[PDB]
Design a protein around this ligand. Sequence first.
Ligand SMILES: *B(O)c1ccc(OCc2ccccc2F)c(Cl)c1
Length: 566
Amino acid sequence: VSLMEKLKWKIKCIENKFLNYRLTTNETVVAETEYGKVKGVKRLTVYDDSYYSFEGIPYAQPPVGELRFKAPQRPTPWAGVRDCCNHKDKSVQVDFITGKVCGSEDCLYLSVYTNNLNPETKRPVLVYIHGGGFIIGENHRDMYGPDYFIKKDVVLINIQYRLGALGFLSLNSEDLNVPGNAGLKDQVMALRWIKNNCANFGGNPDNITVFGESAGAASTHYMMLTEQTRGLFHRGILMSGNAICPWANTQCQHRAFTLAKLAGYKGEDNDKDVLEFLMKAKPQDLIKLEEKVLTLEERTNKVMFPFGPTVEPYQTADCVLPKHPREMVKTAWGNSIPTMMGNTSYEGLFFTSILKQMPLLVKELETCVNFVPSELADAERTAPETLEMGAKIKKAHVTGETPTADNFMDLCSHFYFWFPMHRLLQLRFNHTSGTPVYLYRFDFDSEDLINPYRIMRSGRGVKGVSHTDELTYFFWNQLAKRMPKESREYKTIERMTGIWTQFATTGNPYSNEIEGMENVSWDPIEKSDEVYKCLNISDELKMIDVPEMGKIKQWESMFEKHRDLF
Ligand SMILES: *B(O)c1ccc(OCc2ccccc2F)c(Cl)c1
């Protein structure tokens, strides 16, 4: 927290509103939805393109009052024309830059964008679910502008969903109807809306692609796992994340009481009494205290967030996760739709900011016991077997006699992203109709065009392709600028929106109409593959064996004596 990030961030924000106004037009339009008419408006881009914009389309009732912590309910429709010419608020969260809580409980909205409201053909529909660890994020165009994607003839939809304790509180007591995963059930309801309404915006309801980055990738994967969404969409893209990443789920049923007690609850550890208190609390109080819920023991054992997706303790009407995700892969409908997955070439660089805060973290690599997968480790991480397992990790990532910060961040690349990807691929290969999985590796490094996460990760001046660096080439954000058509950055925008649009359309990401792809033979992964091939996306596009594969096998070797748990 170095105070006046908040300044230029406030004055990049005084600019973003003038610019937003200047890029607005007077061309309003009305579209039909199953809940009533919505009025949208055309907007301009800095590349002199334009698109129709519908923001603040409700897909559920505002989950306020008695609806807090509950599964979403269908919204209440209207006669007349609803105003969708302005965005709604984001879900209640801590602003990662201003450090202050922002947003509203009234956040269950989606936005629809297209360059042509009346196309002559049904268009592929792309649905983006944002990341942010299930605790931050939004569909506001200052972070996720559609301006690049609307160069292509697609319909792009950006959803919101409840975050933090408001989205992911879970209580054991069956009588209370807070089984957990409200935020994922939000996504399910948004997907149902999209399926039933995208046609009114020129979309093909039989050709929908869901994609997401980070927590949005885990979300996309959860939407492919749950039987609640069966057949609602037809392709998935998992960008740096999936549902069996260790940060992507947690059993948090005991932490509601902790949150209550942090906020001033007086009384006993009792689900009913705890729920009653949490129902009454100011939303901004609960979200601000969320950062204090995890114990030192939990943090040591690499629990990243106190509330997130959870295995629900009993089954309700709108249950999304009845079993551990690894179990849900066994029968997942989404196993049998075309899928693309990928990661960046230095994911772990993202934890730069965390390291600067707590330098002593680097000494975790002395034994690496803390990064042994939790299901394998003992609670004190002092067991000799845990020490042995840790030594396998240590050999994969410690390059000198003493671990460095770079070693730590390389390790994080695998703990948080590459190893979970491996486990998923192998698990799914036992339960798939045979539909292809394509892998990419995003390896394009530039500091000439950036996005706000680079601030948060303090990555200005740091080199390598961190977690979230690829977002810059998919979405407009308030820190972006018009780049020369010949720049490597602009060409990367064209390649990324191009490949994603090609995959959305056909279920195959290859096209010789994409510059650089003229010699790419991009083949999906097979069960019989001992080495993964990926499209490596840099200044050149090249098919390579995943450079991370060696370290991936090294992680896998921790499961030599526990193969059932892999
Ligand atoms: B993806 O949604 C994602 C977000 C955050 C992660 O780590 C926690 C974190 C939070 C804030 C700053 C830096 C961080 F690393 C992860 Cl692993 C994934």
